[PDB]
Ligand binder design. Sequence first.
Ligand SMILES: [Cl-]
Ligand SMILES: [Cl-]
Ligand SMILES: [Cl-]
Ligand SMILES: [Cl-]
Ligand SMILES: [Cl-]
Lengths: 14, 101
Amino acid sequence: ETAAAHFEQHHMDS
Amino acid sequence: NYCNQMMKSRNLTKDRCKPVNTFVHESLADVQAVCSQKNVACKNGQTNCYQSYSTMSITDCRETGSSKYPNCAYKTTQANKHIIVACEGNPYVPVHFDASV
Ligand SMILES: [Cl-]
Ligand SMILES: [Cl-]
Ligand SMILES: [Cl-]
Ligand SMILES: [Cl-]
Ligand SMILES: [Cl-]
Protein backbone atom coordinates (compact mmCIF):
# COMPACT_ATOMS: atom_id res chain seq x y z
CA GLU A 1 0.00 0.00 0.00
CA THR A 2 0.84 3.76 -0.17
CA ALA A 3 2.13 5.49 2.91
CA ALA A 4 -1.17 7.37 3.05
CA ALA A 5 -3.20 4.10 2.88
CA HIS A 6 -1.02 2.55 5.51
CA PHE A 7 -1.62 5.50 7.78
CA GLU A 8 -5.40 5.25 7.52
CA GLN A 9 -5.37 1.46 8.05
CA HIS A 10 -3.01 1.68 11.02
CA HIS A 11 -4.51 4.66 12.83
CA MET A 12 -8.09 5.48 11.92
CA ASP A 13 -11.06 4.11 13.83
CA SER A 14 -13.82 6.53 13.07
CA ASN B 1 -9.14 -5.91 24.85
CA TYR B 2 -9.66 -3.40 22.05
CA CYS B 3 -5.89 -3.00 21.36
CA ASN B 4 -5.21 -6.71 20.96
CA GLN B 5 -8.22 -7.04 18.55
CA MET B 6 -7.58 -3.93 16.49
CA MET B 7 -3.77 -4.40 16.29
CA LYS B 8 -4.42 -7.81 14.81
CA SER B 9 -7.26 -6.71 12.52
CA ARG B 10 -5.37 -3.77 11.08
CA ASN B 11 -2.36 -5.94 10.35
CA LEU B 12 0.03 -4.60 12.91
CA THR B 13 0.54 -7.71 14.89
CA LYS B 14 -0.37 -10.61 12.62
CA ASP B 15 3.34 -11.06 11.79
CA ARG B 16 5.03 -9.36 14.76
CA CYS B 17 4.33 -7.48 17.98
CA LYS B 18 4.56 -3.72 17.54
CA PRO B 19 5.59 -1.82 20.67
CA VAL B 20 3.15 1.12 20.29
CA ASN B 21 0.35 2.33 18.10
CA THR B 22 -2.33 4.98 18.30
CA PHE B 23 -5.91 4.79 16.99
CA VAL B 24 -7.89 8.01 16.43
CA HIS B 25 -11.64 7.95 16.93
CA GLU B 26 -12.50 10.75 14.45
CA SER B 27 -13.45 10.85 10.80
CA LEU B 28 -10.75 10.27 8.16
CA ALA B 29 -11.41 13.75 6.77
CA ASP B 30 -11.07 15.33 10.15
CA VAL B 31 -7.60 13.81 10.60
CA GLN B 32 -6.61 14.67 6.99
CA ALA B 33 -7.55 18.29 7.89
CA VAL B 34 -4.58 18.39 10.27
CA CYS B 35 -2.15 18.85 7.33
CA SER B 36 -3.38 22.42 6.95
CA GLN B 37 -3.38 23.24 10.67
CA LYS B 38 -0.27 24.20 12.74
CA ASN B 39 3.13 23.46 11.10
CA VAL B 40 5.57 22.23 13.68
CA ALA B 41 9.11 20.79 13.68
CA CYS B 42 9.45 17.03 13.48
CA LYS B 43 11.78 15.17 15.88
CA ASN B 44 13.58 13.76 12.82
CA GLY B 45 14.66 17.28 11.80
CA GLN B 46 12.19 17.60 8.97
CA THR B 47 9.52 20.25 9.01
CA ASN B 48 6.50 18.53 7.36
CA CYS B 49 4.76 17.93 10.76
CA TYR B 50 1.42 19.37 11.78
CA GLN B 51 -0.40 19.66 15.07
CA SER B 52 -4.19 19.62 15.45
CA TYR B 53 -5.85 22.75 16.77
CA SER B 54 -8.27 20.62 18.81
CA THR B 55 -7.89 17.59 20.99
CA MET B 56 -9.18 14.27 19.49
CA SER B 57 -10.30 10.99 20.98
CA ILE B 58 -7.47 8.54 20.85
CA THR B 59 -6.60 5.09 22.17
CA ASP B 60 -2.94 4.34 22.81
CA CYS B 61 -1.94 0.68 22.54
CA ARG B 62 1.34 -0.10 24.25
CA GLU B 63 2.85 -3.51 24.51
CA THR B 64 3.61 -4.88 27.96
CA GLY B 65 7.25 -5.53 28.95
CA SER B 66 6.91 -9.27 28.87
CA SER B 67 4.81 -9.49 25.64
CA LYS B 68 6.31 -11.58 22.88
CA TYR B 69 5.15 -12.89 19.57
CA PRO B 70 2.81 -14.55 18.82
CA ASN B 71 0.77 -13.68 21.87
CA CYS B 72 1.18 -9.91 21.93
CA ALA B 73 -0.24 -8.21 25.03
CA TYR B 74 -1.28 -4.55 25.01
CA LYS B 75 -2.08 -1.93 27.70
CA THR B 76 -4.92 0.25 26.55
CA THR B 77 -5.11 3.96 27.45
CA GLN B 78 -7.90 6.31 26.29
CA ALA B 79 -7.42 10.12 26.13
CA ASN B 80 -8.46 13.27 24.52
CA LYS B 81 -5.33 14.83 23.06
CA HIS B 82 -3.94 16.88 20.27
CA ILE B 83 -2.29 14.87 17.48
CA ILE B 84 0.95 15.48 15.55
CA VAL B 85 1.28 13.90 12.08
CA ALA B 86 3.78 14.04 9.18
CA CYS B 87 2.24 15.04 5.86
CA GLU B 88 3.51 14.45 2.30
CA GLY B 89 2.23 14.19 -1.24
CA ASN B 90 -0.29 15.67 -3.54
CA PRO B 91 -2.96 15.63 -2.02
CA TYR B 92 -0.98 16.62 1.08
CA VAL B 93 -2.11 14.00 3.60
CA PRO B 94 -0.94 12.22 6.69
CA VAL B 95 1.70 9.55 6.20
CA HIS B 96 3.03 9.08 9.75
CA PHE B 97 1.67 9.44 13.24
CA ASP B 98 4.21 11.12 15.55
CA ALA B 99 2.88 12.04 18.92
CA SER B 100 -0.18 12.80 20.96
CA VAL B 101 -0.38 15.82 23.46
CL1 LIG C 1 8.04 -9.57 16.96
CL1 LIG D 1 1.47 5.56 16.74
CL1 LIG E 1 -14.43 8.29 7.94
CL1 LIG F 1 11.07 18.83 5.55
CL1 LIG G 1 7.64 11.98 6.50
